[PDB]
Task: structure prediction
Amino acid sequence: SPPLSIMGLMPLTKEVAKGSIGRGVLPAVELAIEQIRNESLLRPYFLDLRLYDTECDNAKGLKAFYDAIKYGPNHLMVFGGVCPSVTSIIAESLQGWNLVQLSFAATTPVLADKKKYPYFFRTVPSDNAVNPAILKLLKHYQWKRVGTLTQDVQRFSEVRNDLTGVLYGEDIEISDTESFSNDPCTSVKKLKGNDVRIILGQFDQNMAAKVFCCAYEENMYGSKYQWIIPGWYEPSWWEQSRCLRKNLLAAMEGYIGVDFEPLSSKQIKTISGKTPQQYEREYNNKRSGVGPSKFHGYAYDGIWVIAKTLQRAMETLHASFNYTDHTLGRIILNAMNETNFFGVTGQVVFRNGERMGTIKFTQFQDSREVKVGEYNAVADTLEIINDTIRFQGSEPPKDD
Amino acid sequence: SERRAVYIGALFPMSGGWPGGQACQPAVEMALEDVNSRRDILPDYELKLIHHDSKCDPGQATKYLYELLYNDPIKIILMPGCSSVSTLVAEAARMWNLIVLSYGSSSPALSNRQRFPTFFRTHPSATLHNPTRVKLFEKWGWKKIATIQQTTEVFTSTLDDLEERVKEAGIEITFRQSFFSDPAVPVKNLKRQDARIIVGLFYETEARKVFCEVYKERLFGKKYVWFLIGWYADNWFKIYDPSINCTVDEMTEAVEGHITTEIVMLNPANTRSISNMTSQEFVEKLTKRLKRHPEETGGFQEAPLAYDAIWALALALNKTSRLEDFNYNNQTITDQIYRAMNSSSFEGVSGHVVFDASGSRMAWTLIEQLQGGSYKKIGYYDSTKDDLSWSKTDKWIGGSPPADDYK
Ligand SMILES: *[C@@H]1O[C@H](CO)[C@@H](O[C@@H]2O[C@H](CO)[C@@H](O[C@H]3O[C@H](CO)[C@@H](O)[C@H](O[C@@H]4O[C@H](CO)[C@@H](O)[C@H](O)[C@@H]4O)[C@@H]3O)[C@H](O)[C@H]2NC(C)=O)[C@H](O)[C@H]1NC(C)=O
Ligand SMILES: *[C@@H]1O[C@H](CO)[C@@H](O[C@@H]2O[C@H](CO)[C@@H](O)[C@H](O)[C@H]2NC(C)=O)[C@H](O)[C@H]1NC(C)=O
Ligand SMILES: NC[C@H](CP(=O)(O)O)c1ccc(Cl)cc1
Ligand SMILES: *[C@@H]1O[C@H](CO)[C@@H](O)[C@H](O)[C@H]1NC(C)=O
Result:
């Protein structure tokens, strides 16, 4: 039984905050590896995932990668890369060792650049994947005029920059573009003054409470307004200075949250023979004391992408690894581009290393965010959940 | 009885945004020959070079840094060239307890002791222009300054340093504008606000676009003073660009009178440095080692900084003198060198070599003014000693500098 070695790179230490992602995904990775092994899918070979702690640090992460090359077995590909700066360093260098990389948690749009990161692939949709989804939501409700409120931080300005190209050639006007660093109030007052009704917000959890307080003070809430903001904030994020909690909740009422879908809502058998719901139960059993991670499905499907890629690569060699082999690296790279199966996160397909996945729409209703719809990136289709999504008026708000 | 070999792991950008290793590698090799034939420097050691072409690419540099660190011999220092390559190697080096000495990095971000703990550069930071800018505002009595920048990190970091620096001098930044590529509106607003003393930071292509707009908006005259970077190609404004509506004459009209600051990289004087060469002798010696003319040689003007980098290291290693026992797992030797490098003081081919608290080079700046479509040297400034060399060659319409406001 010869090994098919894979370099697992992620933060694993309890001392590192993002170590919770690396640890939360391991039970899902353990489940996928265990199944592939029993079923002897890669017979006679077996999947040999070796784990190396990046510690969510540029220097430690690079040394972890360097030590894996020096002292570790001959890895065929890289699985992981969670933190943005660490992943960018490793992903940029890949061609040097003819290593294809598959990430399950690095969502930075920067990685979509195939000139700089040719050998990088990801099962998780990037931060920008919300933009084609929002476009469908705007078309669905006939919102042709929007305003933007962005935080002056790279994570948010990258998403706002991508929105320009997404809304170009479409019948959608960005009537007002506003930026802020520490206080959103001036920008919110400018949006009110320009009579903006549909707002596309891109700011962190901390700034969101400030944004909604300004919205209450400027009366930018209720039947006439629709806020479309990030959907990745922690639960009860608002509970955690001038506004009262009741006034914040009044302005927050009806906001639309946008984020990737952690698991498929379709009760259909996936590549493993299990439904997404059956997998979720198996993961929750296996995780034990370990805290769950929203990226667990992406890590699970990630392992299945690797197995299927190695299968196609084995076929290509039969039809006719030191890091020296440019050819095998190209075979693995071409094999991964062919990926097309129904996984726990939905249909697992790549468009230039980028995941064509599912985007979740939520709406804040009284006390919490409630799922209101989903966007299928493959089909470029939106499905609004009947009798979930609500508006304070008789009709959804008008754009002017 | 036997001289022990000691190694440098270098990276030279022979391709890329800055193919600076083309003249810097031979300059480093000449500097190693000169240092090794001196018995007063390192009598017991022979400084040897192991290098690779970074291609001014970080992803590429990563393969070679592994090649440098994961193959014998042990290297005592790491020498990268590009700012992008230095940001990668200087942050990673801590894990192997390595001093990083750059000869071509200008990025202000590299002056960050927490992120880059063992970093030194013979190439100064782009922020060195700032004490010269503040002194020129002080000389001509201006307290209200406008700033325009292309949306680049270097320009953002340099302007952030200018804000802090202007305040320590009792001056204020009136308006700050930025553009990714098209300057029509920022130039537009500069005229609206009646901005009078302006600093503009952009690359050469963008400077042409700014000046055509400056051409269109009558934003040049006795009223206006523009400060720019002195590293553009000669007659950068007569250069033809299909994307500029403005003409050579108009553009020659707009650029007229603007001030430039640039780092002095070769001692203008005819004095002899530690090597016993004059600036002219170094230039002549370097021209000989080259396959092609200095003109088609990348980093030809940064070559003295590369030459002086080897001397700075040699002199630092001389001050410490147990080099063969260096290991990546140990901080002992590293820290002694850090201390020795930190207190560098010598005359190099580029001038007096000293580093500030952040490991960044302290140097003279050359001040120039575009007079009759030509740059005339109006002075030099020494930030560390507040020394200003003034030549009475600056020309202003109406015989005197305009002012920051209406009067
Ligand atoms: C640094 O810079 C300059 C490089 O241009 C060097 O200065 C040179 O030093 C030489 C030292 O002598 C000097 O050459 C001749 O000077 C004397 C005639 O002026 C002559 O007496 C010297 O030779 C000695 O004389 C006897 C005669 O029998 C010989 O047998 C011996 O060889 C003795 O050396 C030299 O022939 C040269 O003129 C001078 N050049 C200048 C421009 O000043 C200097 O050495 C270098 N400095 C260092 C290395 O510290
Ligand atoms: C990568 O895969 C993509 C899609 O799998 C390939 O693009 C398809 O190539 C087939 C040719 O057999 C065409 O019929 C389709 O029109 C292409 N689809 C798209 C969406 O472009 C791409 O050529 C593959 N490249 C590789 C493996 O190098
Ligand atoms: N003088 C060398 C330095 C190299 P870099 O800072 O790494 O781009 C440099 C600085 C500015 C320019 Cl435009 C080109 C090169
Ligand atoms: C180098 O070695 C010794 C020890 O520091 C010292 O006397 C000498 O001055 C140093 N070399 C130079 C050129 O200063």
Chain A has two domains: 1-125+266-357, 126-265+358-400.
